[PDB]
PDB file of C-alpha atoms in Angstrom:
ATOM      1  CA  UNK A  26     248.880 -40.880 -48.985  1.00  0.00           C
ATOM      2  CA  UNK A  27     247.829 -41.808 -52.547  1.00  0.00           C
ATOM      3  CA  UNK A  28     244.934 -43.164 -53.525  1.00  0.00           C
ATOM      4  CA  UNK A  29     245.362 -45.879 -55.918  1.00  0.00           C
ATOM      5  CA  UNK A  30     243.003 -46.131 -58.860  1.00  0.00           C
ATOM      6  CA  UNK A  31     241.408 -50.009 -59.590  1.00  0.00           C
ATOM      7  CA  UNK A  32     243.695 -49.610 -63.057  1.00  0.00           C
ATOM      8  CA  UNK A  33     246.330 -47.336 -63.834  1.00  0.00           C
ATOM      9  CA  UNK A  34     245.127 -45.413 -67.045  1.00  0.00           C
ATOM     10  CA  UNK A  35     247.835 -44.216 -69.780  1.00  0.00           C
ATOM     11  CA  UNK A  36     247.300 -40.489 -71.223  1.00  0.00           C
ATOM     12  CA  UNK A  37     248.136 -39.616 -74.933  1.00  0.00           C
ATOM     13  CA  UNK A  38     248.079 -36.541 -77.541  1.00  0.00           C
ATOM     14  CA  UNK A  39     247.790 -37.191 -81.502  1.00  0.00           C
ATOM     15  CA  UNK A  40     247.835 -33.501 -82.509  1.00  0.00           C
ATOM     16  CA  UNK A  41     245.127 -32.256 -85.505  1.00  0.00           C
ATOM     17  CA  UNK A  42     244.195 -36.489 -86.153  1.00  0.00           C
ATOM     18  CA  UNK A  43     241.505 -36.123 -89.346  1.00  0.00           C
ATOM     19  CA  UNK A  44     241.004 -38.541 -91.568  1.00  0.00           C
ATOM     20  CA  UNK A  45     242.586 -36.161 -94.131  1.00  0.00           C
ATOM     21  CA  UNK A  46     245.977 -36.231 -91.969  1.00  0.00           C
ATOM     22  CA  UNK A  47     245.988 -39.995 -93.056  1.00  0.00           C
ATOM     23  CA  UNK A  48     246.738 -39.414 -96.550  1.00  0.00           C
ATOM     24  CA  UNK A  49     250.126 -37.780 -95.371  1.00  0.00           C
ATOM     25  CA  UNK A  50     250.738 -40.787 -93.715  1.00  0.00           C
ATOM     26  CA  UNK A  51     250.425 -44.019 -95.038  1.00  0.00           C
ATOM     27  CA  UNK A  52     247.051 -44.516 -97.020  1.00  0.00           C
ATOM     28  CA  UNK A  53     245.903 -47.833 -95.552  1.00  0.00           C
ATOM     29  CA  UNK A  54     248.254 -48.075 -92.524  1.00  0.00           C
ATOM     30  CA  UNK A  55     247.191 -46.444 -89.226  1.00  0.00           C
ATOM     31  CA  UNK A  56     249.462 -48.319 -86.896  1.00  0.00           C
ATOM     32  CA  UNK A  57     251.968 -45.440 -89.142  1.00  0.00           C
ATOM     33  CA  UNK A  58     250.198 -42.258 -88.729  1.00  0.00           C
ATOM     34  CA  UNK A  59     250.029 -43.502 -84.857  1.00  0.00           C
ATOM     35  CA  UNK A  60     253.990 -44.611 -84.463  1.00  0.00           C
ATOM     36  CA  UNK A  61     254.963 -40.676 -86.083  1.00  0.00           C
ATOM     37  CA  UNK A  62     251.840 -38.545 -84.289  1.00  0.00           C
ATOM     38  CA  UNK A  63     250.689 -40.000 -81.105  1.00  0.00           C
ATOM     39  CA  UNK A  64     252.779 -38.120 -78.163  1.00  0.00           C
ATOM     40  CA  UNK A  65     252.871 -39.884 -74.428  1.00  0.00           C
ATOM     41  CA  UNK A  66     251.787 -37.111 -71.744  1.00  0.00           C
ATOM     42  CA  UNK A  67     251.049 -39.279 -68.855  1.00  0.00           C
ATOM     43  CA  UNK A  68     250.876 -41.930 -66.790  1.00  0.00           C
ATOM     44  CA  UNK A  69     247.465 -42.173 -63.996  1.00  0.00           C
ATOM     45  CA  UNK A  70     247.959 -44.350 -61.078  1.00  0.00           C
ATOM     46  CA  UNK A  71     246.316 -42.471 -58.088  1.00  0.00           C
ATOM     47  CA  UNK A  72     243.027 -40.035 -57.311  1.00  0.00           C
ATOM     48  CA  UNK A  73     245.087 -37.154 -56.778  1.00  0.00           C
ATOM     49  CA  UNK A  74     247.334 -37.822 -60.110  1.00  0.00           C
ATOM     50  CA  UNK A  75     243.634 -38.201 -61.882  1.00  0.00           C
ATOM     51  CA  UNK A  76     242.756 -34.557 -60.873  1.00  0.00           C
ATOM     52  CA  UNK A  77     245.916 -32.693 -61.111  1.00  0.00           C
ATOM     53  CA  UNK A  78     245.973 -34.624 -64.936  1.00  0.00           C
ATOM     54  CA  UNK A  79     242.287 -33.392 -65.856  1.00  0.00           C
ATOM     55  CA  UNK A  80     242.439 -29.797 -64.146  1.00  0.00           C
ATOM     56  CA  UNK A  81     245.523 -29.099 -66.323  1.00  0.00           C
ATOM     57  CA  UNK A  82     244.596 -30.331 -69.958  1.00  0.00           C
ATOM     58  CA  UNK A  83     245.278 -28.198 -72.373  1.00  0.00           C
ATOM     59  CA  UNK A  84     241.310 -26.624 -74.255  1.00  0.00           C
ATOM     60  CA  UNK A  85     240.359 -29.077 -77.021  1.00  0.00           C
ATOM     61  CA  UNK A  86     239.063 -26.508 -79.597  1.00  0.00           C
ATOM     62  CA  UNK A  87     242.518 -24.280 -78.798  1.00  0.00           C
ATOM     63  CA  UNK A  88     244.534 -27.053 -80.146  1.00  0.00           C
ATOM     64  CA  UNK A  89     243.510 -27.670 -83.744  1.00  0.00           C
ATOM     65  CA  UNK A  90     240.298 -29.752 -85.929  1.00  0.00           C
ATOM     66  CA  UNK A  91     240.717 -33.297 -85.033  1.00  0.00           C
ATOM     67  CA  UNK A  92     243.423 -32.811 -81.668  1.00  0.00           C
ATOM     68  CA  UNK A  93     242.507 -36.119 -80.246  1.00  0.00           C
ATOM     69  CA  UNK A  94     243.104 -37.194 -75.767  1.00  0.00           C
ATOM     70  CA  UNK A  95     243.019 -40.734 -75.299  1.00  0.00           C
ATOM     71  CA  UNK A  96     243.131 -42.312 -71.935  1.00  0.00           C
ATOM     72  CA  UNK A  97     243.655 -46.042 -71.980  1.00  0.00           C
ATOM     73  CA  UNK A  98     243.245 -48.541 -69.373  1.00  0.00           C
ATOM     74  CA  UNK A  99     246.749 -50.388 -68.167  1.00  0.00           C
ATOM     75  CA  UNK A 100     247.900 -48.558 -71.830  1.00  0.00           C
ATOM     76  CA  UNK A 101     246.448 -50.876 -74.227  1.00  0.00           C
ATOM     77  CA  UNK A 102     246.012 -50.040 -77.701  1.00  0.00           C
ATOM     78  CA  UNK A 103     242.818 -47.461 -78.317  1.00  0.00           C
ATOM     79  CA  UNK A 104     242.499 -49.264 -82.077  1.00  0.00           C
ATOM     80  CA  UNK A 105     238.882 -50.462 -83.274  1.00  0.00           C
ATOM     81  CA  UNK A 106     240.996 -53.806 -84.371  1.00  0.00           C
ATOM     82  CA  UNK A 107     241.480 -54.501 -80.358  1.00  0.00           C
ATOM     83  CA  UNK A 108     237.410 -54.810 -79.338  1.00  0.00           C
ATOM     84  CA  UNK A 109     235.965 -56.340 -82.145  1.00  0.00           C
ATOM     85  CA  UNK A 110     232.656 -56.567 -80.309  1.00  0.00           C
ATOM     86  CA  UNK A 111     232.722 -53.782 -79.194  1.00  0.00           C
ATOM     87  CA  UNK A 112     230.951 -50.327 -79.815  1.00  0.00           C
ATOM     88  CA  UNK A 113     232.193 -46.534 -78.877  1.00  0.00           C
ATOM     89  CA  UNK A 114     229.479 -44.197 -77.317  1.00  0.00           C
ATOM     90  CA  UNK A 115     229.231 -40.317 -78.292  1.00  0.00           C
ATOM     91  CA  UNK A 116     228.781 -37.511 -76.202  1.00  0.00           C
ATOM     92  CA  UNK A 117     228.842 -34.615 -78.977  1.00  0.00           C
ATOM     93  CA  UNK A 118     229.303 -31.506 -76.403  1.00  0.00           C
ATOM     94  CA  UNK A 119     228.691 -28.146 -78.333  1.00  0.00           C
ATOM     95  CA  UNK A 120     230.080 -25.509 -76.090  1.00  0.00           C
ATOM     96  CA  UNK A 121     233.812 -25.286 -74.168  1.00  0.00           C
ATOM     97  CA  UNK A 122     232.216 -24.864 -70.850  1.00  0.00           C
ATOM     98  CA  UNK A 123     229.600 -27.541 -71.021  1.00  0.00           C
ATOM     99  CA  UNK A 124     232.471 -29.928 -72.485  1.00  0.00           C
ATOM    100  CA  UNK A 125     234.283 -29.245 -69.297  1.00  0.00           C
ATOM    101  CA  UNK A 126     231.528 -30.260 -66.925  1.00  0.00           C
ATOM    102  CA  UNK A 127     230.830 -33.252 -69.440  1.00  0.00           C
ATOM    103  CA  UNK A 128     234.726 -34.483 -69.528  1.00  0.00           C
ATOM    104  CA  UNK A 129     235.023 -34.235 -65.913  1.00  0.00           C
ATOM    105  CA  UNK A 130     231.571 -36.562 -65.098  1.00  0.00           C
ATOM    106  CA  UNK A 131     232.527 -39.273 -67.995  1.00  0.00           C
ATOM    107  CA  UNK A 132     236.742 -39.515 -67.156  1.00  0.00           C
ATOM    108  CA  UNK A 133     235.350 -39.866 -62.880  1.00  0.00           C
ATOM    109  CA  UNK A 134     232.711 -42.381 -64.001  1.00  0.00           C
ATOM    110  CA  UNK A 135     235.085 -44.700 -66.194  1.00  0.00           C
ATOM    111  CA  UNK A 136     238.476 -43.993 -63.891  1.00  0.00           C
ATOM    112  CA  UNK A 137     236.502 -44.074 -61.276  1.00  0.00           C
ATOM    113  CA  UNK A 138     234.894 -47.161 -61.646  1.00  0.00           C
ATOM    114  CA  UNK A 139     231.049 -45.308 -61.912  1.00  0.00           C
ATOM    115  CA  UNK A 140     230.069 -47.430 -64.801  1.00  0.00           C
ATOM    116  CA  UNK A 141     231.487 -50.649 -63.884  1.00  0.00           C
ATOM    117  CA  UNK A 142     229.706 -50.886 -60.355  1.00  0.00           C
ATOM    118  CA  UNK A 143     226.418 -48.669 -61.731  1.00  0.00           C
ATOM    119  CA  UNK A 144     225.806 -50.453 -65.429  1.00  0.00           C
ATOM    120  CA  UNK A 145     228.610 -53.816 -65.591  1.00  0.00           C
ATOM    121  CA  UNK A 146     227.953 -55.345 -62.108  1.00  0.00           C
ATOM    122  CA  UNK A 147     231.733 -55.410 -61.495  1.00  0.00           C
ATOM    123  CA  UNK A 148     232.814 -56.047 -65.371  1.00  0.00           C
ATOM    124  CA  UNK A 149     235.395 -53.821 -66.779  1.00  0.00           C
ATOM    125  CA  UNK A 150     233.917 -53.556 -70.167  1.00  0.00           C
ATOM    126  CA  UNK A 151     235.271 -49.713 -70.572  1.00  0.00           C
ATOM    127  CA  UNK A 152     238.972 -49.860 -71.546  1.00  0.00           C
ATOM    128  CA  UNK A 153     239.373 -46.208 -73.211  1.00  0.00           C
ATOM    129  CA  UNK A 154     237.999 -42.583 -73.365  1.00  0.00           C
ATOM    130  CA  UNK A 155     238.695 -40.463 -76.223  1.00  0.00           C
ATOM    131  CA  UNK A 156     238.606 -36.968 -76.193  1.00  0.00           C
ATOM    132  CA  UNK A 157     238.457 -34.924 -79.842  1.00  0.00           C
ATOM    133  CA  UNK A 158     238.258 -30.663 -81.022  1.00  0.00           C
ATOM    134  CA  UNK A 159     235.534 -31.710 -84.077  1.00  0.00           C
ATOM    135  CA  UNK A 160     234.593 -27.998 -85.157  1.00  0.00           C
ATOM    136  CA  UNK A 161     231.617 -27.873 -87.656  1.00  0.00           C
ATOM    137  CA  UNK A 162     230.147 -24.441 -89.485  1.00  0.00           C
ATOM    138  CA  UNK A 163     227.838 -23.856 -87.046  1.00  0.00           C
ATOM    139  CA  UNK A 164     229.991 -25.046 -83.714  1.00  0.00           C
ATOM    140  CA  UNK A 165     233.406 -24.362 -83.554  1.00  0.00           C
ATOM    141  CA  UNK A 166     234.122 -25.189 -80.263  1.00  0.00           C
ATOM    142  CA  UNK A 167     232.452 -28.685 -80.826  1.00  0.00           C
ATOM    143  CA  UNK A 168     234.033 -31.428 -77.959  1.00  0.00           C
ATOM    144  CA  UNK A 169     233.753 -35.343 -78.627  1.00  0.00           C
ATOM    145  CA  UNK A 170     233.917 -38.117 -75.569  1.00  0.00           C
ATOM    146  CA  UNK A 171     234.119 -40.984 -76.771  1.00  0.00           C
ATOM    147  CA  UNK A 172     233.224 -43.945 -74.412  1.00  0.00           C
ATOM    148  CA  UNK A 173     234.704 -47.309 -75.838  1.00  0.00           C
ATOM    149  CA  UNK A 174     233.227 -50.960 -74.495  1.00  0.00           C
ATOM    150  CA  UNK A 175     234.565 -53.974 -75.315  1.00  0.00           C
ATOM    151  CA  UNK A 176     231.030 -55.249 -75.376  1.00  0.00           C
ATOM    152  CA  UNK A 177     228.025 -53.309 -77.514  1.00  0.00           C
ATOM    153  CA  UNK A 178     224.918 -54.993 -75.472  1.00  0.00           C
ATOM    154  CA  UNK A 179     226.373 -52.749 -72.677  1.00  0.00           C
ATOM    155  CA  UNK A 180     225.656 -49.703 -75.413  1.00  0.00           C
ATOM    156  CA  UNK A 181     221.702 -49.390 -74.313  1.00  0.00           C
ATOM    157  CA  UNK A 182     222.793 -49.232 -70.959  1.00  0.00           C
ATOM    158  CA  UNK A 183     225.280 -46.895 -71.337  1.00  0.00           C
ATOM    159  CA  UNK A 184     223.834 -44.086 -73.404  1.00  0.00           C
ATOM    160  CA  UNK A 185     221.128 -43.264 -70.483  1.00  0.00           C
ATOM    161  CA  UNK A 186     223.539 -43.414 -67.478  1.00  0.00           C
ATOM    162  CA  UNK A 187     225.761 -41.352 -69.359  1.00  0.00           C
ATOM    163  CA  UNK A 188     222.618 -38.628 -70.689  1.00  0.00           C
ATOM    164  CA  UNK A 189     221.135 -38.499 -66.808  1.00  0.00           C
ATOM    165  CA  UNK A 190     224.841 -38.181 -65.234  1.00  0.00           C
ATOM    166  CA  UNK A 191     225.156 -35.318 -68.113  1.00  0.00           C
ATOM    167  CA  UNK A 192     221.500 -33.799 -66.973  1.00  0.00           C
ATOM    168  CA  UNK A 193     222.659 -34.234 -63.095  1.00  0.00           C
ATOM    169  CA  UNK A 194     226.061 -32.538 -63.660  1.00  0.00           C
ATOM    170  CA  UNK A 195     223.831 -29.246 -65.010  1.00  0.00           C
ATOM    171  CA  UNK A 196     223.802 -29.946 -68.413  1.00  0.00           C
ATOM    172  CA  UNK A 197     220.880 -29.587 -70.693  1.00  0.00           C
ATOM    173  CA  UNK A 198     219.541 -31.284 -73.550  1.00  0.00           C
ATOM    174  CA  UNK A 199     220.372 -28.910 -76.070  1.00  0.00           C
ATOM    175  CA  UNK A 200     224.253 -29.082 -74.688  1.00  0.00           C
ATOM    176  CA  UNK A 201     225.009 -32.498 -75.717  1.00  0.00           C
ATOM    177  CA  UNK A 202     223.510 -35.177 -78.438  1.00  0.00           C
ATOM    178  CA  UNK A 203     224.394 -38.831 -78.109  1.00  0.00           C
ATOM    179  CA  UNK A 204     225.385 -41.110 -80.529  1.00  0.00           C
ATOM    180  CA  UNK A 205     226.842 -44.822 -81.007  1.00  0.00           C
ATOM    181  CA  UNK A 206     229.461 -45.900 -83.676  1.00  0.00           C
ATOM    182  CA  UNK A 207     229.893 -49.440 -83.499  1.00  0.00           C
ATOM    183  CA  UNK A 208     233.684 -51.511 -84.384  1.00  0.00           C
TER     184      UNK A 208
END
């Protein structure tokens, strides 16, 4: 009937997030910019709630610079404070099309448990996925995944299961650039 995930995962919006947008809030204090920006849009329990979620999100770069998606595992907090040996790896996706084909392998290999039975022998070590709109001079419809492990010695491992599951789903070397920003 429906196909329960291993962990639900909790979907939410913070609309045009830059680190400029912090100075409206208060300087320091993110937990504040969070509390008045960050907007709840779902709740994924099931297979068929993952793909009716993903097929129907809203284009990154349409929504405005620094429009952030973050889907959290059993809705913890995605804050660098909660893994603090932890790391977050990049996918930098240039194009809208090739961001779509990027989104849908990385959310199906975290939500769907890829990761943790291909690279963490059974270990959840992924917790969140973060999806930004980062347009630059050159790339305005510039996509960042963001692919957040509690543990950084899973980071090596990582980057090169994500970059051949990137090649595999059709996309080139030229369409993506990884990158690793540790907490």
């Amino acid at each position: 009937t429906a196909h329960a995930l291993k962990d639900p995962w909790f979907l939410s919006y913070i609309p045009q997030l830059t680190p400029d947008t912090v100075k409206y809030d208060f300087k320091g204090d993110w937990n504040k910019a969070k509390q008045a920006l960050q907007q709840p849009l779902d709740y994924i329990r099931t297979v068929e709630e993952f793909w009716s979620t993903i097929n129907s999100l809203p284009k990154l770069h349409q929504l405005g610079n620094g429009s952030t998606f973050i889907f959290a595992r059993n809705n913890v907090d995605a804050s660098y404070e909660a893994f603090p040996n932890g790391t977050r790896v990049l996918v930098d996706l240039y194009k809208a099309s090739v961001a779509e084909k990027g989104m849908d392998f990385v959310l199906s290999s975290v939500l769907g448990e890829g990761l943790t039975y291909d690279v963490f022998n059974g270990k959840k070590v992924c917790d969140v996925v973060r999806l930004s709109s980062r347009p630059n001079q050159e790339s305005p419809e510039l996509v960042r995944l963001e692919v957040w492990l509690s543990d950084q010695l899973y980071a090596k491992d990582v980057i090169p299961y994500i970059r051949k599951g990137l090649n595999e789903a059709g996309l080139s070397f030229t369409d993506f650039i990884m990158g690793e920003s540790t907490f």
